[PDB]
Amino acid sequence: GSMQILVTTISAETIRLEVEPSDTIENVKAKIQDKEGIPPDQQRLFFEGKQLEDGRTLSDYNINKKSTLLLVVKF
Amino acid sequence: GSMQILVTTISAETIRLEVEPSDTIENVKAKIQDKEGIPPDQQRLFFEGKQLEDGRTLSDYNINKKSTLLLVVKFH
Protein backbone atom coordinates (compact mmCIF):
# COMPACT_ATOMS: atom_id res chain seq x y z
CA GLY A 1 0.00 0.00 0.00
CA SER A 2 1.02 3.60 0.98
CA MET A 3 4.12 2.23 2.85
CA GLN A 4 3.85 -1.25 4.43
CA ILE A 5 6.44 -1.81 7.21
CA LEU A 6 7.27 -5.03 9.12
CA VAL A 7 7.58 -5.00 12.93
CA THR A 8 9.49 -7.98 14.44
CA THR A 9 7.89 -8.18 17.93
CA ILE A 10 10.07 -10.21 20.37
CA SER A 11 9.37 -11.33 23.98
CA ALA A 12 11.93 -13.48 25.85
CA GLU A 13 12.54 -14.78 29.41
CA THR A 14 14.70 -17.49 31.08
CA ILE A 15 12.95 -19.61 33.73
CA ARG A 16 14.80 -21.87 36.18
CA LEU A 17 13.02 -25.11 37.10
CA GLU A 18 13.84 -27.51 39.95
CA VAL A 19 13.10 -30.95 38.42
CA GLU A 20 13.92 -34.64 39.13
CA PRO A 21 15.66 -36.81 36.42
CA SER A 22 12.62 -39.14 36.90
CA ASP A 23 10.20 -36.30 35.88
CA THR A 24 8.24 -36.82 32.63
CA ILE A 25 8.09 -33.90 30.15
CA GLU A 26 4.28 -33.76 31.00
CA ASN A 27 5.31 -32.81 34.59
CA VAL A 28 7.87 -30.28 33.17
CA LYS A 29 5.08 -28.54 31.15
CA ALA A 30 2.89 -28.55 34.31
CA LYS A 31 5.69 -26.72 36.24
CA ILE A 32 5.81 -24.02 33.48
CA GLN A 33 2.00 -23.48 33.88
CA ASP A 34 2.58 -22.66 37.62
CA LYS A 35 5.55 -20.34 36.82
CA GLU A 36 4.13 -18.41 33.79
CA GLY A 37 0.52 -19.51 33.12
CA ILE A 38 0.74 -21.36 29.77
CA PRO A 39 -1.24 -24.64 29.17
CA PRO A 40 0.82 -27.81 28.35
CA ASP A 41 -0.96 -28.40 24.97
CA GLN A 42 0.19 -25.08 23.43
CA GLN A 43 3.74 -25.47 24.90
CA ARG A 44 6.53 -26.69 22.56
CA LEU A 45 9.64 -28.04 24.36
CA PHE A 46 13.06 -28.61 22.72
CA PHE A 47 16.54 -29.95 23.61
CA GLU A 48 19.44 -30.57 21.13
CA GLY A 49 17.03 -29.62 18.29
CA LYS A 50 14.67 -32.56 19.02
CA GLN A 51 11.06 -31.75 20.05
CA LEU A 52 10.49 -33.13 23.57
CA GLU A 53 7.40 -35.41 23.35
CA ASP A 54 5.26 -36.69 26.25
CA GLY A 55 5.44 -40.30 27.51
CA ARG A 56 9.24 -40.10 28.03
CA THR A 57 11.43 -38.61 30.84
CA LEU A 58 14.30 -36.09 31.18
CA SER A 59 16.71 -39.10 31.51
CA ASP A 60 15.60 -40.45 28.06
CA TYR A 61 16.86 -37.24 26.34
CA ASN A 62 19.86 -37.19 28.80
CA ILE A 63 18.95 -33.88 30.53
CA ASN A 64 20.98 -33.10 33.68
CA LYS A 65 21.97 -30.11 35.92
CA LYS A 66 22.42 -26.72 34.13
CA SER A 67 20.84 -27.96 30.81
CA THR A 68 19.40 -25.34 28.40
CA LEU A 69 15.83 -26.19 27.25
CA LEU A 70 13.90 -24.27 24.56
CA LEU A 71 10.22 -23.27 24.92
CA VAL A 72 8.42 -21.65 21.96
CA VAL A 73 5.00 -19.98 22.61
CA LYS A 74 2.38 -17.77 20.80
CA PHE A 75 2.24 -13.93 20.23
CA GLY B 1 19.69 -28.58 44.71
CA SER B 2 18.82 -31.93 43.04
CA MET B 3 18.60 -30.69 39.39
CA GLN B 4 18.06 -27.04 38.31
CA ILE B 5 17.48 -26.68 34.52
CA LEU B 6 17.13 -23.47 32.45
CA VAL B 7 14.18 -22.98 30.07
CA THR B 8 14.70 -20.32 27.35
CA THR B 9 11.08 -19.13 26.78
CA ILE B 10 10.65 -17.36 23.39
CA SER B 11 7.54 -15.66 21.91
CA ALA B 12 7.64 -13.90 18.49
CA GLU B 13 5.31 -12.35 15.83
CA THR B 14 5.65 -9.94 12.84
CA ILE B 15 3.20 -6.99 12.60
CA ARG B 16 2.28 -5.27 9.28
CA LEU B 17 1.85 -1.47 9.51
CA GLU B 18 0.52 0.96 6.88
CA VAL B 19 2.42 4.20 7.68
CA GLU B 20 3.21 7.57 5.99
CA PRO B 21 6.91 8.68 5.57
CA SER B 22 5.75 11.87 7.42
CA ASP B 23 4.70 9.73 10.50
CA THR B 24 6.70 10.20 13.76
CA ILE B 25 7.84 7.21 15.94
CA GLU B 26 5.20 8.18 18.62
CA ASN B 27 2.47 7.73 15.91
CA VAL B 28 3.94 4.33 14.81
CA LYS B 29 4.00 3.28 18.53
CA ALA B 30 0.30 4.34 18.78
CA LYS B 31 -0.46 2.10 15.72
CA ILE B 32 1.15 -0.90 17.55
CA GLN B 33 -1.22 -0.27 20.55
CA ASP B 34 -4.23 -0.69 18.16
CA LYS B 35 -2.80 -3.88 16.53
CA GLU B 36 -1.43 -5.72 19.64
CA GLY B 37 -2.39 -3.76 22.80
CA ILE B 38 0.98 -2.52 24.17
CA PRO B 39 1.37 1.07 25.61
CA PRO B 40 3.73 3.34 23.57
CA ASP B 41 6.25 4.20 26.34
CA GLN B 42 6.86 0.55 27.42
CA GLN B 43 7.82 -0.49 23.83
CA ARG B 44 11.36 -0.04 22.38
CA LEU B 45 11.68 0.46 18.57
CA PHE B 46 14.84 -0.26 16.52
CA PHE B 47 16.12 0.06 12.91
CA GLU B 48 19.74 -0.57 11.74
CA GLY B 49 20.71 -1.08 15.42
CA LYS B 50 19.76 2.52 16.39
CA GLN B 51 16.97 2.99 18.97
CA LEU B 52 14.09 4.90 17.33
CA GLU B 53 13.12 8.10 19.27
CA ASP B 54 9.43 9.27 19.61
CA GLY B 55 10.07 12.74 18.09
CA ARG B 56 11.87 11.93 14.79
CA THR B 57 9.99 10.83 11.62
CA LEU B 58 10.46 7.60 9.55
CA SER B 59 12.17 9.76 6.83
CA ASP B 60 14.89 10.86 9.36
CA TYR B 61 16.02 7.20 9.83
CA ASN B 62 15.39 6.59 6.05
CA ILE B 63 12.60 3.99 6.48
CA ASN B 64 10.78 3.06 3.24
CA LYS B 65 8.64 0.21 1.74
CA LYS B 66 9.54 -3.39 2.87
CA SER B 67 11.66 -2.14 5.88
CA THR B 68 12.17 -4.50 8.87
CA LEU B 69 11.68 -2.74 12.25
CA LEU B 70 12.49 -4.34 15.64
CA LEU B 71 10.19 -4.13 18.68
CA VAL B 72 11.46 -5.59 21.98
CA VAL B 73 8.55 -6.27 24.39
CA LYS B 74 8.55 -7.27 28.11
CA PHE B 75 7.99 -10.95 29.12
CA HIS B 76 4.47 -10.47 30.62
Author numbering:
A (entry chain A): -1 to 73
B (entry chain B): -1 to 74
Give the exact sentences the study uses for this entry.
A multi-step purification of UbV.XR resulted in the isolation of two distinct fractions by gel filtration chromatography. The earlier and later fractions eluted at volumes consistent with a dimer (UbV.XRD) and a monomer (UbV.XRM), respectively. UbV.XRD forms a symmetrical domain-swapped dimer in which β1 is flipped 180° away from the β sheet of its own subunit and is replaced by β1′ from the other subunit. Whereas residues 6–9 in wild-type Ub form the loop between β1 and β2, in the UbV dimer they extend β1 and participate in hydrogen bonding with β2′ and β1′ to form a continuous anti-parallel β sheet across the two subunits. Taken together, these findings suggest that UbV.XR dimerization is critical for XR binding and stimulation. The β strand domain swap in the UbV.XR dimer appears to be a unique arrangement for a Ub-based dimer.
We report the development of three ubiquitin variants (UbVs), each binding selectively to the RING or U-box domain of a distinct E3 ligase: monomeric UBE4B, phosphorylated active CBL, or dimeric XIAP. With ∼600 members, the RING/U-box E3s form the largest family. This family uses a RING or U-box domain to recruit E2 enzymes thioesterified with Ub (E2∼Ub) and facilitates transfer of Ub directly to substrate. RING/U-box domains promote Ub transfer by shifting the equilibrium of E2∼Ub into a closed conformation (Dou et al., 2012b, Plechanovová et al., 2012, Pruneda et al., 2012).
